[PDB]
Design a protein around this ligand. Structure first.
Ligand SMILES: Nc1ncnc2c1ncn2[C@@H]1O[C@H](CSCC[C@H](N)C(=O)O)[C@@H](O)[C@H]1O
Ligand SMILES: Nc1ncnc2c1ncn2[C@@H]1O[C@H](CSCC[C@H](N)C(=O)O)[C@@H](O)[C@H]1O
Lengths: 288, 288
């Protein structure tokens, strides 16, 4: 599909003597997957600012990052003054809530409802955190969304962000079936999925003991995908974290139920997919 | 209180050339605290047999011990034939459910109801697993119960088990307020609480980040014992595991709610108290 045409801006590599840690703005953070991947790659983080509403996700971040995260409330409360007073950013990330962007809803409300239009909030903060002309600072940005969108919606998003959406499927690097569009200007945006041997490709490596995988991988019949003691059992939450690439026992931070952990892990990013995406940032920024 | 009088049987120490791994019968296992403590002390376990009813506790054991546990169902299904066919045991452990043994109930049903009389099931399996006369094999046993019992109940239990109940309070070695009676014939049954520096004595060492302990320790006002972001918050389950001496994120094994994790962790043993109790077994049995 060639509807628009624009070259991706490739920044020159900075040497090690002018190497600086990253300043990261994370708009729709949720479960703090971005800072988790950044800490796993061994990258020094000078400032991480997450604008999260949901208190369970804020609790996930406060437990798993120990007060490193600077919290904002709603993204509508962020102005241009808040962007220009919190220093210039080096990495902007986010994925808008796809309640009305997904075409799996028969009665979907579209891009221009209060769940979808938050994307434009992103664009506004994309417009504020972007450096002006004449500044050769390497500025990188990343937007995530689902594959189940309309043609006009994806076309308008691609025109607004001015980048080619690469499609990445979790089955090439992890044990999940979800294809996601990624807008951004990272180097090697469409390079193939370098599967890490430490990543759990099959489903059975993500299971616990005493459980047999019925399928080869899981999706995002009135049965259950795991047999347990010759009985079909629901897929566990820690096993869901191992499928989604998270560390073991990650989203157990408060007194939330099983349904809350499902709602948090469903909306979260895939750790291996991000690790692939954030990989070339290591040569552009600080290392630890 | 000197109502009965009997000397504790002290077994001779076996040297290292005749040293064998342990065979453990665990009647009212629940959360597998005994085998956890045994693996933490570095003791080779040849056979561990847990007779547990509740499927959540069986799931805890299957996750945290990887099929090492031989499961029986109800303790009433165990006969003398099952004891004599599963080899002679070296350590028998258990704590009966104190639904009717506790005097915190105003309408308590007593020792001789189906929650209390399961203790006698223990005694029956204590009678079957005990070696006959002439056998100098070191056989050890341990029964646990709450402090809130009647005088006649504790007297009858002490007469039936023929041992002096030592009282151990969790506050001397951990951050919990519970005193428990321990019947048994382990060496150093009433030696004082050797507090380990690796054990978390204070409550604040068991908390996560961003939470301030209101009290010095927790119990087993319409307020909450932990402030979180200048707001009173319920004590977390993983923090409850850190209080009770369990490893971090221990009882997160299936899709159980907060109330199920409370019901499992409440009935469970205190890991440091057991570690103290199981400590002298290291010189009588195998080491790893
Ligand atoms: N107006 C808003 N501003 C900021 N966050 C919002 C928001 N509305 C909802 N959220 C929260 O932000 C998250 C966006 S949903 C997708 C999250 C993202 N894919 C991830 O990496 O986890 C949701 O968890 C939702 O609870
Ligand atoms: N008849 C029975 N036989 C075996 N287990 C039983 C039982 N009835 C109840 N149980 C279970 O056995 C446990 C006894 S309650 C106390 C458990 C013990 N203090 C511990 O170390 O965890 C409870 O979790 C209960 O679910």
């Amino acid at each position: 599909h060639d509807q628009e045409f624009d070259p991706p801006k490739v920044y020159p590599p900075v040497p090690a003597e002018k190497r600086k840690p990253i300043r990261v703005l994370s708009l729709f953070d949720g479960i703090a997957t971005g800072l988790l991947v950044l800490k796993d790659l061994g990258i020094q983080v000078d400032r991480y600012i997450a604008s999260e509403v949901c208190e369970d996700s804020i609790t996930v971040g406060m437990v798993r990052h120990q007060g490193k995260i600077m919290y904002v409330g709603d993204v509508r409360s962020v102005t241009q003054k808040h962007i220009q007073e919190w220093g210039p950013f080096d990495l902007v990330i986010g994925g808008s809530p796809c309640n009305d962007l997904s075409i799996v809803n028969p009665a979907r409300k579209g891009l221009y409802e209060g769940t979808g239009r938050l994307f434009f909030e992103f664009y506004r903060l994309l417009h504020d955190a972007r450096p002006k002309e004449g500044d050769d600072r390497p500025f990188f940005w990343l937007f995530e969304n689902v594959v189940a969108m309309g043609v006009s919606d994806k076309r308008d998003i691609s025109r607004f962000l001015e980048s080619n959406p690469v499609m990445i499927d979790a089955k090439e690097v992890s044990a999940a079936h979800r294809a996601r569009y990624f807008w951004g200007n990272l180097p090697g945006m469409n390079r193939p999925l370098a599967s890490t041997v430490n990543d759990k490709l099959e489903l059975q490596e993500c299971l616990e003991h005493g459980r047999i995988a019925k399928f080869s991988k899981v999706r995002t019949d009135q049965h259950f995908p795991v047999f347990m003691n010759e009985k079909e059992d629901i897929l566990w939450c820690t096993e869901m974290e191992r499928v989604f690439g998270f560390p073991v026992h990650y989203t157990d931070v408060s007194n939330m139920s099983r349904l809350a952990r499902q709602r948090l892990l469903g909306r979260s990013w895939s750790v291996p997919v991000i690790r692939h995406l954030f990989a070339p940032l290591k040569e552009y920024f600080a290392c630890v």
